[PDB]
Write a protein that binds this ligand. Structure first.
Ligand SMILES: Cc1cnc(O)c(C)n1
Ligand SMILES: Cc1cnc(O)c(C)n1
Lengths: 218, 218
């Protein structure tokens, strides 16, 4: 039959997923799990409990609170050939982590949309590793100062930042002055140079830390 | 044998992923690569492969040796390895990560390697737009060379300095300066410098600055 091949292909793909350190898995058109390797089941609280066939509202991890929105993603992949990447920042079973979950349509020798495949990648450590690699390819900021500097390093001017944060330009100018002085820079251009050379382009404003998200990248 | 049933299943798998995906052997001779990869390498459209890494119509081949070296220290392990590949690929310079894992199959023998190519620039920019959206509720469309020329214009260099650093004629760099000027609406070089400096363009870093050919493991 053809179902013979559609079950040989699926056991192929569990053998495939079972030998990667990344969280790998596939679920159905009901967003119900068909398989997930030991990495994925270990990122959720499912260390040794092998639970499968359930929804994203799994056992033993905070991920379940966004299970709903997971499945929503799981259907907008299914109505398309193209893949979609999800930034999942979550208090996983061993602390807060910044993952990328790439979700792709599941096609098989059927040719039918059977569900989705998801590939989770741990961005926390590799962000720093690739950052040191890429740049060798070539002070206590407050929260608002971190925001102002994030947008300064990204081509915005003081009036643009005033708009983005809903304060007056004088307020943002005062913030820039205090950032500049904390860097020891003599003017805005020296501030840009100092911040770019000290790794601050890769800084994430700490007000963003430890808040649970899952967002499709666009 | 059953393990080449698994190879055909994963060939169908790789053939239905938007990412550059492929498999090689212990002699690093190609076993399969989807249309994305060999369109990212020069074999867009044409050659099925039974080739090594040197046999491709793209400058990547000059680093085939070190590719193969990577392909041998993944193979003597189970865990993944991430390689920063910055290359003038068949459609321009790109910053990829090639994550390579051993090719294990229902035999259990190390048959070769699987490589996953991910464009790091695109997903980095996607994560940055996502972070901007989390922090919230005039696109002049400069080319890459124009971005480089303006970067150096704002830093006190003249057209012949840019010509030297970029290996182009002084008249080519002057044409680039003229077209940047017109895109800004500036009347002369110094008004262009002032306008760009006041519009936040001092903080843009050209991606062309990372266009140095490397392939190195993290
Ligand atoms: C942690 C997580 C996030 N999104 C998903 O779709 C899955 C399956 N797991
Ligand atoms: C561009 C590139 C780098 N390393 C590899 O292993 C392959 C297959 N392609």
């Amino acid at each position: 039959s053809i179902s013979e091949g559609d079950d040989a292909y699926i056991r192929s793909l569990i053998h495939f997923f079972g030998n990667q350190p990344d969280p790998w898995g596939i679920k159905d058109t009901k967003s119900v799990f068909i398989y997930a390797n030991q990495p994925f089941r270990e990122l959720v609280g499912m260390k040794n409990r092998n639970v499968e066939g359930l929804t994203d509202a799994d056992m033993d991890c905070e991920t379940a609170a966004f299970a709903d929105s997971f499945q929503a993603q799981d259907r907008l992949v299914e109505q398309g050939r193209e893949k979609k990447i999800v930034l999942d920042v979550h208090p996983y079973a061993n602390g807060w982590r910044v993952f990328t979950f790439t979700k792709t349509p599941l096609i098989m020798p059927s040719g039918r949309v059977a569900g989705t495949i998801f590939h989770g990648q741990d961005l926390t450590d590799t962000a720093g590793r690739i950052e040191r690699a890429v740049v060798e390819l070539l002070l206590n900021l407050t929260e608002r100062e971190e925001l102002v500097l994030f947008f300064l390093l990204r081509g915005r001017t003081a009036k643009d930042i005033a708009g983005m944060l809903g304060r007056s330009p004088r307020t943002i100018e005062h913030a820039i002055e205090r950032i500049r002085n904390k860097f020891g820079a003599g003017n805005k251009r020296e501030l840009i140079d100092m911040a770019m050379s000290k790794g601050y382009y890769s800084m994430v404003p700490k007000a963003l830390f430890h808040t649970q998200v899952s967002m499709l990248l666009k």
